[PDB]
Write an enzyme that holds these catalytic residues in place. Structure first.
Site, PDB file in Angstrom:
ATOM      1  CG  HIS A 117     -18.670 -50.642 -14.288  1.00 16.73           C
ATOM      2  ND1 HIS A 117     -19.851 -51.234 -14.737  1.00 16.73           N
ATOM      3  CD2 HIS A 117     -18.547 -50.888 -12.963  1.00 16.73           C
ATOM      4  CE1 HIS A 117     -20.415 -51.818 -13.694  1.00 16.73           C
ATOM      5  NE2 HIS A 117     -19.656 -51.637 -12.613  1.00 16.73           N
ATOM      6  CG  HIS A 139     -22.012 -48.509  -9.405  1.00 16.65           C
ATOM      7  ND1 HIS A 139     -21.962 -48.852  -8.064  1.00 16.65           N
ATOM      8  CD2 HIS A 139     -21.409 -49.487 -10.125  1.00 16.65           C
ATOM      9  CE1 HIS A 139     -21.358 -50.023  -8.005  1.00 16.65           C
ATOM     10  NE2 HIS A 139     -20.999 -50.428  -9.230  1.00 16.65           N
ATOM     11  CD  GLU A 158     -24.746 -51.545 -10.888  1.00 20.99           C
ATOM     12  OE1 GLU A 158     -24.031 -51.440 -11.860  1.00 20.99           O
ATOM     13  OE2 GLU A 158     -24.441 -52.273  -9.843  1.00 20.99           O
TER      14      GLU A 158
END
Length: 344
Positions: A109, A178, A309
């Protein structure tokens, strides 16, 4: 379904003169969405049940401090590159790049300080807000100055998120959100009673490190087949599954396409998702361990929330058979995701 009105306020103040974080509230006749300038984080999402009772349907924190502590990316924007990058390494135009290994033995991420943990600049719109920021060349090991715009709009029970970006140099880009959802309300202990549908024929099986093996496995015959609505629990049990954390392959063009439908019959809420993205990461909050101080005394235990996502496939930068993830100067990155709330 009416166009939303927008309100703003001071939510918190970042330590070390980090700056002022604001909160923007988008309200329509059907929904109310709360969003903060720090990581374009959706902090609250109130949706109605059959009885017109509105429940905040996203896990989050009452205060900023809550976002700053060690937490798993609650409802923020993720980038420069969502998900994992094998070995935190990739090559662009013959050149090899190295990222932070914030998740041995990989990069996840966006690195140590990804998009979810930076302050964005807000511009209020008629029926929403737009966040902008510049991720400079080298940010987190990535090449090129990336100019990004995150635009959240609300019309009725429809929350639209759009992502626009421009690179100064070829670079990978894969942005998403998220947020963790629990249609039965943020404070519910689980998601077992949720009924799910994901329009995907194939999925990406992963490895020991949670990196796609590279195989684009069909879902037929598998526990990964969510083409027909299934009840989470039954399913997970029937299949002797612990939860999910995989990328489902959407049958996409860049055109808007269906992605998933989640239904909570007891409350009657329905969440439908549409997107221009090639995949969706479906994650069942497997890692929640019940130690987080949520909103309204909520503590979050495993399986208390799920994520959808929408994005480009994980590790795409290193798997040529995957949809292209590179943004070159001159082109424009632009993806949209629709979060349509209803009652069934």
């Amino acid at each position: 379904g009416h166009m939303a009105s927008v309100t703003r306020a001071v939510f918190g103040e970042l330590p070390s003169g980090g700056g002022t974080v604001e909160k923007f509230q988008l309200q329509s006749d059907l929904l109310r969405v709360d969003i903060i300038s720090w990581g374009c984080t959706i902090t609250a999402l109130e949706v109605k049940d059959r009885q017109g009772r509105a429940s905040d349907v996203v896990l989050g924190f009452a205060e900023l401090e809550g976002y700053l502590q060690k937490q798993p990316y609650f409802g923020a924007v993720i980038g420069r590159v969502a998900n994992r990058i094998a070995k935190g390494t990739f090559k662009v135009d013959g050149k090899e790049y190295h990222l932070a290994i914030n998740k041995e033995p990989n990069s996840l991420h966006g690195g140590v300080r990804g998009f979810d943990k930076v302050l964005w600049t807000p511009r209020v719109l008629s029926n929403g807000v737009q966040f902008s920021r510049i991720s400079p060349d080298g940010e987190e090991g990535y090449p090129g100055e990336l100019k990004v715009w995150v635009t959240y709009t609300l019309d009725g029970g429809e929350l639209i998120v759009n992502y626009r970006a421009q690179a100064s140099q070829a670079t990978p880009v894969n942005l998403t959100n998220h947020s963790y959802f629990n249609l039965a309300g943020q404070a519910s202990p689980n998601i077992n009673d949720h009924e799910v549908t994901i329009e995907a024929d194939t999925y990406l099986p992963v490895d020991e490190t949670l990196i796609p093996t590279g195989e684009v496995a069909p879902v037929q015959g598998t526990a990964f087949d969510l083409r027909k609505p299934v009840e989470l629990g039954k399913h997970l049990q029937d299949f002797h599954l612990n939860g999910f954390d995989h990328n489902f392959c959407l049958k996409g063009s860049k055109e808007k396409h269906f992605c998933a439908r989640v239904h909570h019959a007891a409350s009657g809420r329905v969440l439908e998702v549409y997107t221009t993205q090639p995949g969706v990461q479906f994650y069942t909050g497997n890692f929640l361990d019940g130690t987080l101080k949520g909103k309204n005394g909520a503590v979050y235990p495993k399986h208390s929330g799920f994520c959808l996502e929408t994005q480009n496939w994980p590790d795409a930068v290193n798997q040529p058979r995957f949809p292209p993830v590179l943004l070159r100067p001159g082109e424009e990155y632009d993806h949209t995701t629709w979060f349509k709330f209803s009652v069934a």
